[PDB]
Design a binder for this molecule. Sequence first.
Ligand SMILES: [Ca+2]
Length: 341
Amino acid sequence: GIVLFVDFDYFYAQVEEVLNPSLKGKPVVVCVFSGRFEDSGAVATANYEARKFGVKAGIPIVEAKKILPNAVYLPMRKEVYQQVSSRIMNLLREYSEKIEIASIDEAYLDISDKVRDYREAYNLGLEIKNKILEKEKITVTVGISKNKVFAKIAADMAKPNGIKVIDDEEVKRLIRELDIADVPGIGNITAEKLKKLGINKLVDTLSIEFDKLKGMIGEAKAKYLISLARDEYNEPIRTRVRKSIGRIVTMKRNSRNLEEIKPYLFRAIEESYYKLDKRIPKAIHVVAVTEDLDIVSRGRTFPHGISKETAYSESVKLLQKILEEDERKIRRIGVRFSKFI
DNA sequence: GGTTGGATGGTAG
DNA sequence: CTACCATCCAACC
Ligand SMILES: [Ca+2]
């Protein structure tokens, strides 16, 4: 069981570097701009010179602007990076045909066939790294071990433009002195929830009862963490697929008014049908983030696929229903497409 | 255990 | 923020 996990360095902000190579060795800040008062939104990426002063993904742009007004701020042509991204997954493919893609900047090979050992994986890892740079000029950080986790952590280690191999030995020393924060899948909140309760490293979850675990952080992650602490996590490298496809866009203000919301709600359906391409969903869900931050889904499931027109007037009915149940003015809206054929 | 309800939170790029 | 998944009461074949 050998894994070859690849990961595209500060990807979005990195592609803007290669595109405009007069944008480099400098603070770059890829941004999703919301629309409201004189900028507003949140960071989706920043290169390392940016995020060495704190300007990291998901923080209000005004901070990014109040730590690095120096910086370069660029919008977020997610389409574009997608283009460039897909092209990489082809290269990752050539060298092993069990390519589990995850996020736009990430993917895993189960190369256990075109390697006899780990020495040879490093050599390959350099190959891939050398082919992705050559053809698209994008540095990426490979990571290698027994499993998609250890593979990922090893990348988390020498993260920017790097390559590491966690054999079995280092597999075991991590578990003891690897923090639950640094354990992929586990975002902070789970960690801080665990952090609070005396609970830091991953192995500590073996000195703790199970029902006092799914009674805080839940099963999937309860077991998931206990399995790697036991080490019995070496589960498969299988491709990923999309259930939902949505777009909740920010309105001009807060509106209890069928007509006010409509074009925003129709603009969503619109773009939602950009990203959907050839495919055809059975179910639809009209999302609403209110005045405050409540979230007010109502939805509908068919025994057929939906068609865009159908998708508009059904959306409204599903919106009408938000207004004789909610009474609070609504300040964000969108749609969602579950259940594909 | 399936399956369609909706409300929240957690994990990302 | 935008996007997507998981996650947990609630009905009910
Ligand atoms: Ca990544």
